[model samples]
Target chain A: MFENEILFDNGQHKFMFLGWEEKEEEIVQTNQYLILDGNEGILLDPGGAHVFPRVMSNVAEVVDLSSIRHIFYTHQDPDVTSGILLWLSICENAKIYISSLWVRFLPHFGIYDQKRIVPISDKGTKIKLLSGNELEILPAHFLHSTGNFVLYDPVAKILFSGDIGAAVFEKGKRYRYVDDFERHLPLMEAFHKRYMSSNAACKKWVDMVSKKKIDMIAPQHGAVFRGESVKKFLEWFRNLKCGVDLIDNLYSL
Target chain B: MFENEILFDNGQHKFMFLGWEEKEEEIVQTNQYLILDGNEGILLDPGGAHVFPRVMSNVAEVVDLSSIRHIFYTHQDPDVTSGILLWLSICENAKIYISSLWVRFLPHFGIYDQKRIVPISDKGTKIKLLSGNELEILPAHFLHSTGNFVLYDPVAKILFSGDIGAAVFEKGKRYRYVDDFERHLPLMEAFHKRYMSSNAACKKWVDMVSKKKIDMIAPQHGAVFRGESVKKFLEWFRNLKCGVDLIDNLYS
Candidate 1:
């Protein structure tokens, strides 16, 4: 199991990754994040039900559960939201901020009240932390899920990209940041080809995120992209043919 | 995989259950429901991510995905709302109706636009179906989840009690409607004792539902409570001391 690691820490605002457990047989390894601004905190894609205990203990080491006023979801996948009920069970006062599209559906996870959630629009919205620092919820739809999003902290110059730029590494490899974009393509190619719906969708996401002043592109899975690698991945992903485009009828028998 | 089965029908309005794959070791067996009225339909507690494929195919056999205009979540539990992204993938025009308390949290299921959801207040609200029939959303809070609710169809006199009367039965027990409330207690007692938070919440829900003209109490899990059993279940649940109350420090 991965322990909580601080990714960025300014005196006022802090970003932490609540690590992931590396199971040799596991195909999908997920990461959870926390954004702390003064007394208020936000949890991003808080992992699945299995990781709830680990995440809770790790989070408690940093901030009290009640201080987490908001929980942001990048999308509605099980790995991202299955643990929500456990979180809500304890963090009774915290509100979950998500896309308005999935508001009616999340209750299946045990949220019976609407008062605890704030739905964001496709155009994106702003959240004012208890520290009075405002962070942006950037729209990153169709990177995989129809209504995906990423958290942009202008103050930290970090973009918590949900699944975009996510990679699945072979067992035993422990690199945390990408140093060579070309060498990293092999680890990311197959997953992206099938997982991402289309190149057009990738272009749309890359084009929109291009305008943001981002220093680190931290995906929920795999290594973080920084400096030149961030720009390189965007350029490479923008030109990639994925989803149905990669389908070959010749192999269909 | 179980096929969709029609539970209730009255020419103009219909109710169906999207079947489940019965697992012998399953601890929590969930159900997904559909209410069809003319050209429009509403899916209730549409199950979890794992059940999405089965639900989608089963729902397609009865109604076009596009015909599903509204999705109702009695609460924000994964079993009730996790498959939401799959539904939205096909039914882009469909809007989800849920408690105003969970409006912001629902989006984590892949909803990024407010236009796709309608948040109902604690006082409850009305949904006008395409057939022009109005369905009532009733409040049933604190019996379990602090923001729980039940859907009531006045015309059919059927109350979709989310988890209020839910029971956990042994594998292969095919009882559909409750016949013996006393015997049924064994199947439900422990679940209610731990899952439900308070007796006051149960009493509050029982008191409000007592005023409704309910014919059947269809819980999300277990057998349906009908006729006299419906009244019996409510009375029993109303007085049951559950959740924290059941705990005894003496055992510790």
Candidate 2:
């Protein structure tokens, strides 16, 4: 079920998809990503405790654990951060970059040293890799979680959206990009409506990200949004009525 | 219907509950809290847009609008922070304190100036009120939301727990404290099992707070926990297997 692939490679900078499992019994499907800038690497949302062993073996196949100088968490969801304790036990020099809101909470996972944890502000900040390449932390809150974020690598023109474009798929039907926007609605509509809190928040996020020159939008779940599909999804999300917006007088009275 | 009540009054430091609507069709029950330390006042999880008017009117009864120097958000839930824009607009100089994670996200609520917001770190920090009273921010992550927190006042020994002991009640039934922990289980069991992510988080929270001498555990929803009830809740929560732990092999 492990299927790791390189999404972007420019010799010096590489974006790798650390594979996702599509087993029938799996209740939730999750994606792990790895980004390399020269010899320095950063793991994005390495995933839960159960996935640590698989991710470790898969990641070791391509990059040395020592090269992974940073681990970035877009939010504090267990699916994205539960493995921090295991990762910290091994990655001695690696520093974790998470939202300032979750800085104290990481201690619950057995990380006691505040020096190893870097808290990013909500206004978004730039992080420099050990090799000197910079990555931007873009705020994508309320796409589902209140404190969620997405990563933007300007060099690759790729946006790693935590859950903004995530979709649920049946087993054996995963694709790298959305081939049909209209057909893909069923996969993501219910999820966005149920999980996303407000259409106002959706429109605000779209308005901000639309200014960027993004070529691909990768999510933590389901398929990635590329080229024309990225534009379509943004427009669709901007106009969609989700969360409390879907509640009417009949239901609220 | 609005039903405002003052729970604690130490003369110097006062705690007030700003009423909640108990409508039959309402999907969720929410609470708004106000803490006053002399001339400085802070609003905790002020609540959704609908509750804004009621909270504002009720809040004005005790503290002046100018006295509300700060508004603290436990996390980014709409029921808590959605009304922030309205508060900012009317409160003028009031600074909103939220998790640093949601700083950039405030623009989504129409707030663009970073100067108006202060980000609180995870290890929890001390916040000084206008009157010079300091409150401690206690980390309570994974107590339903990833970035959640509870506010603690050493002077009053009251813990403003966001949603840790929250319970869903049928219309018209409200209690200040649980008379019997066994009977209270039915109201909170399902919510905890469905919302709390891990047993590890629950136990860790219990372990940390157990060391503190907490006089009251005030949640954003449901009744407050006082006296022996606080200890009872901690022990019960520490033992419960919720969220992912409740998911069976067959379902997975």
Candidate 3:
């Protein structure tokens, strides 16, 4: 549980990923990515409260956690935000960003001062870090949740795509980045087919990203899509008929 | 971190509490208690995610985490349940006991196999341990959280009072049990005054508890009520004008 990897570093700006090797036994595995710009940082999809002890300690190794000024949630799922209240408490200066749809619901995990929570609209938004690096919050509504959002760090050319690209793996069947897009299909197919709302939303997100210079696509769960794999995932996701689209195939009386 | 005081023992049963002096710098202090009877055990109010590393280790000293077949949560505060999934994870065989009101909300912490979660109804229920000892899941609703419950161990005569008897004390001002009832009032007053819903709910809980032979009052936070302090707390609590009865309420 106490391990992290530096995914990107260009001296002044860095993106570090933790929770890769320390998959909690049995519960859904999640990936926590922190983009650091000088002394400021933005955390992407911190895992549930169950993993906080390790996540907090692991994050402390990467930067002064209290200096973490912003936290972003792809959705209000427990795996994405249960550990959140602890983050807000630990990083006293931090303000959380989630879709406006989940603003009222996030407190079931724990309540905090309303000012610390920033609700993103359907159009999504942007955040300017203390370093002046702009992190774009792109709308990812209905790919998972109605108000889902993802982060596009133009500085690092990485798109944090919430659960739109998320995959599920059996215990020990884990990897940091997509090694082979074909081999990774089984890991992702079932989850996206069931969880991602529809290919229509996926195509919208894909088209939204097609315009950006994304070198990597980080997900809330499973591997990061790097290099050509990023384009391959977009293509694969754009055509994948999931959730409501599969309702006919999955449920039949 | 690996420390626990054996609060009760009678050849076949025992009760222990952890998180005494090791305050976590700035977070609220919480106490975790475990009642062991022969081969089975029940953990009460296992604390937040931050304290899991210490609470889990301390609990292992008392019983096999697996032997802890039942986990009981008094309410749904992060301090009481944020660390729950880890307990539900570590004790693979254990099932969680929480208010039915919070059954849906608990998952925000983490999703679990539904069967592993046993929700206590408003009336509450009792669980029979492997040793044939029955522990009462008593309802102490609206004392703080709308859906709340506390544990009553007939074996040890201890009432695990959830947040009903809870107190908020500052750093370095912690003790295992109530040293002086009068001095402890300040620590508990502010919390109960602001929390605990109403004097009506307080009276109902006291009346429900008055019928039980409770020798000790173990709250989720601050000090435990031992000896006369238990009666002392109930007396001060019944007459205590807090919560709604108090907008009838505090600057001092």
Candidate 4:
């Protein structure tokens, strides 16, 4: 009913991601993504418990909920996990894959009790799909939540970094890159140390993944990073203390 | 513009306030009553920051802010306190009185500094106005906030309970007694126990105040309560623990 065209048309599929306007900060906006090429649609974080009613019409236009084969999450935050329960009720075949750590934490938010959640072990397990595509479940050391993982698509070159590079306050229709990493680094580093504080483990995962060529980095919190910006960030990550874990016992900077 | 009139003709000077139909639930409103005989204007909780700009013109038809000598808070929640900081910036002479406990807590919400807020120590603090009429501070005990207090006009008989006996949700235009309070008690009890948590303290305050004969109860959240409904709520508050407090603590 609201008047606005779907923002991006990537020849194969249309991405009609919803965002919360500045006025009502209470209502969380769910991030929905679709792959029109093979009619393989995915809904990331559909926001809190109430966001679905506002977004249902927009989602129905792109793909039928019954047709949604795979639904995934970045982490188990309410903004990501709450609406998935509703989505699962509608989409009978949708198999949800969450990080093993979140599998333990999901019950606190009322998202668990057996039937829906499928946990992936942290042994760097890669699940191969019958469709000939494979999803590499790489463990992210300490990004936002303790049991955080990024989904990697080797063919499409997209890495869904769950809460890795998140931005909270913004003023616009869409999210854009930050003004400077130097100014923003302290806040992100502090958050990492506070919530995701295990450093040595983080370095091991980043160093191991540095070998794979990444094209796009789509984080749970902020705008997606691609092209030249992604390359620059990779270089920065390789050089900073964020890449190689520090030996300091202090938790925060 | 809003479509309601101030019922000042009542001997009690209760400001039966209402908001515009379009901006109903998202806004808080109050009846600004100035006892002409007393020279003191009770500017109620002036709702949120946005309500003032929209209804300021309509409000001027009744009383001016310059005439507002005393500002009072029912509770220290955002909807009631959002405009308090703005009021402090503009109304230089008005002294704010909130419960002793909330005086310590207001800074977290940026409503007042340590220097400006006056903690109501006990009942019977009187302000003799320029016109010789008096504004008296009365304690409602731990009714809503840990330091909740109410302002009473033995002359007017209006008791503003910060959150005590407050309605559940905001309704359109204006809400009334009996029906509205009945609709909101479940929510009020839920939110009260969830936030306040001390059933023993709540019962003590409820019993202490239930003895008084109040004509109307102006709560910080939702609509105002009048007549027997106020007494019925006092009885309910005396008995049960508000379940919402536990849920709120866990969620937070």
Candidate 5:
């Protein structure tokens, strides 16, 4: 029932932590984050089965799902939103904001209904919930999915890079900071090489991110990077190279 | 929903049409008959999935499953009682009368409640039903299963043969009489000699059934036979001699 809040800066932004602990076989600990911009709170990718009991137990610590204005997901992976159906059951009025291209994949796993979903297609589109706070959606095409988007808080200079530096199968509270970057680089590289194979595309995203004053880079999977680590990771990403001849016939006849 | 009954003027009797047709898969059926003077309902092996629906439909037509006092199976096959769980759900109070030796085989198929099942051990034990019908439970000993039994209904004069007269495929309904023994004999021999060669105990069952004044013969598979056809079948069954040999494991 403990609510863990870690501030990004002295007074700019704060992150509310909702984490999971694996119990048995076929179960994983789900971690969720609430992005706080001034008075606005946006819960991103509330993780699966384990999240439900946590949400119910610490009801006062988290925002009532019904009252929450907007929610977002990084990708359509099971760990990301297995408990979402439980959330939707309670959050009748809350708007679920996701990428349009990835929406089709949801119903196959039993997530449906168009009324609750708010799809963001391209860059510069803003989702305004409260008076002064808005979620700026920018596309990260082919990073993992075609509709993958990175959300940025302009005033706070915090970039929530969806699945860009995501990692799975790791444990502990390892946030992407100065000393942690060295430990996380290999894990991040192994993931990046598998999915985001285009060096040109990786360089483009890095250059685009550098344009804005990015103080923190929060990914969906492994950890959150801030300060000097964010700068160092982007530099390393720009110089990285990947071959394009890899052939995969996942669903071929 | 029509209940089909075949009365053999001998001491035994058998009832037909005990199943429903599946759209594409095999049609499932049940075989429950009576042994006269012994006063027992010789409910033969009921097929799976189709058992409950057939029993419920049959009970609705004539008598309730409660009227069914005893049950016996030839082997521990799913087609024998896959729908058994479904039947037990309704007829919870009836005893699952089966062979004493095949007791261990019941739970292997997930059916292992001790309260409902009753094992009958003595071979040729005289049994009777509430309807004043008499029967004798004769073990077909190691015929197909370690504990297979053949029931003889004295009043109806019928032999509820388990799987002895099995054929490769179904023939015409008009070929129901046991007198068509010549036509079906080749088919039965192919299945018995080739597939069920392990049925070394079949000779004992054939010998026991022939001595009785049998008017009809009800097999687990294929059509039921009546009158002289039943006698003709017994004669053909006794005369035929084949040695038991293991079939090849390979299926072409």
Candidate 6:
């Protein structure tokens, strides 16, 4: 089983990288991130029912489940949403922040209470914590899903890129951090080609994200790109021509 | 192209059957229903984008788009919702009525306004029209979808059954009503076996519906069952085994 590992920490706040166990091959691998800001915690794509017990225990290790005051969804995928109804019930006061465009789709997941949903506009916004500090919700449209976003922790300078730079590796090949950037290229290459929407979307995200001073790029899947690999991954992503850019023959009969 | 036809009429309200075109062979046949209740109108499962222009024109013939105060979706299917965003945009003042369970998924269709969505709880509800009259959102869960409902007009006694009793007919094979109940049995047999979740669900619906004074049973597809045909369809559906009930061999 993979254990939840702390990524960054300061005196008052802690940033932890939660995990999907290495042996659970039936369900796909996903990366969950949690931000413990004093008494309040913010969970990013805390994952679905399959991993709820694991993610909940991992999250509880840092802060009380009640301390989870905000839940943010980068995109609406069952992998990121199936466990949502349970999470909302566990964290009684938590509010959900999702792209405003995807606001109407959450109900099919059995979320009826509108009072808890706070839709983030396409322009994105800085969600203020109780302590007056804020985390940035950055626009990441078309990187994968149509209405997508990435979270930026201003304090730790970590970019939780929803699905960008995501890679899939079998049990034995798995590693948390990209140890060899060039060798790691193959794992992520197939994903970006098929998962991403278009090269134009990737370029737009790069233009916006490249300006930020991020120390680590934590993707929802695969490994975390830390230090120099952050820049390496961004450079590779900016020039990548994937998704719709390569699908002309897909429409053929 | 097929045009919308009236099913029942009184002084204050009229229930009409809307249609998907006869020529739209690429897309399947679906029946949309609208109730012009005073100045307020209630539309049921308005079909998707493929039939929007056709459905809209037929709807406009009966009542102004703005008068469409409530749009009820029995369940969330693309055939019932792909045209929702456009319908919401056209009928700016209309509120959407759907099962509380399926409420969260409409955003994929580009509906963002919470102020306009009225979620019908699992218990279902008496949807109040502007004229102080009410239409019932009857429980129809598990007949097809997990959270579902059939719209019932008390004034007209017409049950706008979502997918229950529905049949998918080829272009020329289409019939608007159950002309011969015995002959029509085959048309619905295959769909009930595949589309419906279980005979238990169908029995639950029949038990609830059998008591009601229904004059017509209008489904989302194929035909409308009139008078004695209404009882014929229910008796047939109540005992039928479908979906999970027949899935043991599917797993094997």
Q: State which candidate has the highest DockQ.
A: 3
Q: Name the lDDT of candidate 5.
A: 0.54
DockQ of each: 0.05, 0.03, 0.05, 0.01, 0.01, 0.02
Task: Report lDDT per candidate.
Answer: 0.74, 0.74, 0.75, 0.52, 0.54, 0.77
User: What are the per-residue Cα lDDT tens digits for candidate 2 across B1-252?
Assistant: 347777688899888878765453333567788988888888988875656787898888888888888888887665677566678877776888877545544553342456888887655677887677888887666566655678887777888889789887865776656667778878898767755655766777777777777888888877888778788888999998874454331010
DockQ of 2: 0.03
User: What TM-score should be assigned to candidate 1?
Assistant: 0.54
Question: Which candidate should be chosen as best, given lDDT against the real structure?
Answer: 6
On the 0 to 100 scale, the lDDT of residue A142 in model 6 is: 55
How many residue pairs of model 6 clash at the backbone?
Answer: 8
**Is candidate 3 or 5 superior in DockQ?**
3
Instruction: Kindly give the stretch of ten consecutive residues in candidate 1 chain B with the minimal lDDT sum.
Output: B243-252
**Model 5 misplaced stretches (Cα beyond 4 Å):** A1-3, A9-13, A20-30, A37-40, A55-60, A168-180, A242-253, B1-252
Error of 4 at A10 (Å): 41
Q: For model 1, give the TM-score of chain B.
A: 0.91
**Model 4 TM-score, all chains together:** 0.44
**Predicted candidate 1 versus true structure: per-residue lDDT over A66-162, tens digit per residue:** 8988889887666687777788777777888887756655755553566777888766788887767888898765466555678888888889998
- Models 1 onward score TM values of 0.54, 0.54, 0.55, 0.44, 0.45, 0.53
How does chain B score by TM in each prediction? Answer: 0.91, 0.93, 0.94, 0.74, 0.77, 0.96
Q: Given candidate 5, what's the lDDT at residue B127?
A: 58
Compared with the true structure, what per-residue lDDT tens digits does model 5 show for residues A96-189? 7766534533442233455777766544357775656566776554454333567776756678787676654454444433356766687677
Candidate 6 lDDT by residue in tens digits, B30-127: 78999987788888998666567878988898788988888998876546765667788889878999876555445534425766778887657888
Chain A superposition TM-score, candidate 6: 0.96
Off by over 4 Å in 1: A22-27, A247-253, B1-46, B49-252
Check candidate 6 and list the clashing pairs. Answer: A104-B107, A105-B104, A105-B105, A105-B107, A106-B104, A107-B104, A107-B105, A108-B105
| Tens digit per residue, CA lDDT, model 2, A9-99 | 9999999888654554333567788998988888888876666787888788888888888899987665677677778766776898887
Candidate 5 CAPRI category: incorrect
What local lDDT score does residue B151 receive in model 1, on the 0 to 100 scale?
A: 92
Tell me how far the alpha carbon of residue A249 in candidate 5 is from the true structure, in angstroms, after superposition.
14
